């Protein structure tokens, strides 16, 4: 998370981090339900066998609301291709239900129509993570949030250097050095509407971190509802 502020207590309760056998947090995720976690398909690669920590705001000072979970079944979108990052999305079924308490809660999934017409038509959205904080820098130790504005689709397609499929979307800044970064994938992109947050995108990719002229591409969750839906039935 380049720039941005700092996720305070229970200000990013849907945030989830995927840890490796070395306990290192390598990617992000979003708590959709007590049993299901939303993440990026391409994140299921930087680890042979990983786990999912939640309710953690500082990866150094031990708090109390943290809690580790084990993936019972990974649900990678068949259509994914590392070659294009298309359909960058997966859904993790946990073995133990997640217990909602301070700094731990699920984020709402919106209706495809309503969402696209009211949540992505908004000025900004939120992205959060433990990811790198300066493209070259190291993995952050505190979970932070960055308010990122939506990017005009056209501008998006022009600023990029890759084919922005219908499955992805743009959000961030042109010149300002604020945007997700290393180890921030899978992370949550949420949009606020009346103090209630909705899952409006997965942290997918970008050409660097905060690079001028370039933006940050997010997996358009809105275009995956029905999947994610009959996904939380396991498929």
């Amino acid at each position: 998370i380049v720039g941005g502020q700092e996720c305070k207590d229970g200000e990013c309760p849907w945030q989830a981090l995927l840890i490796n056998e070395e306990n290192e947090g390598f990617c992000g995720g979003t708590i959709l339900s007590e049993f299901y976690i939303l993440t990026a398909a391409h994140c299921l690669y930087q680890a042979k066998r990983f786990k999912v920590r939640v309710g953690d705001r500082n990866t150094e000072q031990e708090e109390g609301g943290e809690a580790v979970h084990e993936v019972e079944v990974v649900i990678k979108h068949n259509r994914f291709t590392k070659e294009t990052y298309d359909f960058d999305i997966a859904v993790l079924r946990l073995k133990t239900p997640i217990t909602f308490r301070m700094n731990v809660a699920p984020a709402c999934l919106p209706e495809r129509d309503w969402a696209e017409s009211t949540l992505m038509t908004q000025k900004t959205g939120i992205v959060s993570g433990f990811g790198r904080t300066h493209e070259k820098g190291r993995q952050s130790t505190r979970l932070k949030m960055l308010e990122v504005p939506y990017v005009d689709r056209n501008s998006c397609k022009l600023s990029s250097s890759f084919i922005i499929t219908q499955n992805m979307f743009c959000a961030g800044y042109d010149t300002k050095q604020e945007d997700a970064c290393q180890g921030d994938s899978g992370g949550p992109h949420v949009t606020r509407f009346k103090d209630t947050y909705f899952v409006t995108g997965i942290v997918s990719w970008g050409e660097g971190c905060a690079r001028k002229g370039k933006y940050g591409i997010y997996t358009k969750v809105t275009a995956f509802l029905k999947w994610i839906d009959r996904s939380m039935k396991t498929r």
Binding site: E11, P13, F100, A105, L109, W114, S117, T118, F193, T196
Partner: protein
């Protein structure tokens, strides 16, 4: 009608059923009496910040 004026005055979702508008909430809430608001059912509803 008009889910375009101010989201139909709904709290969350919105649908222009034929002539008029009809509200709804996400799993976890319940539609108030006025049929515009959303009401939780658990201590931890989705989308709410645990403060």
């Amino acid at each position: 009608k008009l889910c375009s004026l101010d989201n139909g005055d709904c709290d969350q979702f919105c649908h222009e059923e034929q002539n008029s508008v009809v509200c709804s909430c996400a799993r976890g809430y319940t539609l108030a009496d006025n049929g515009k608001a959303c009401i939780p059912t658990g201590p931890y509803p989705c989308g709410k910040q645990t403060l």
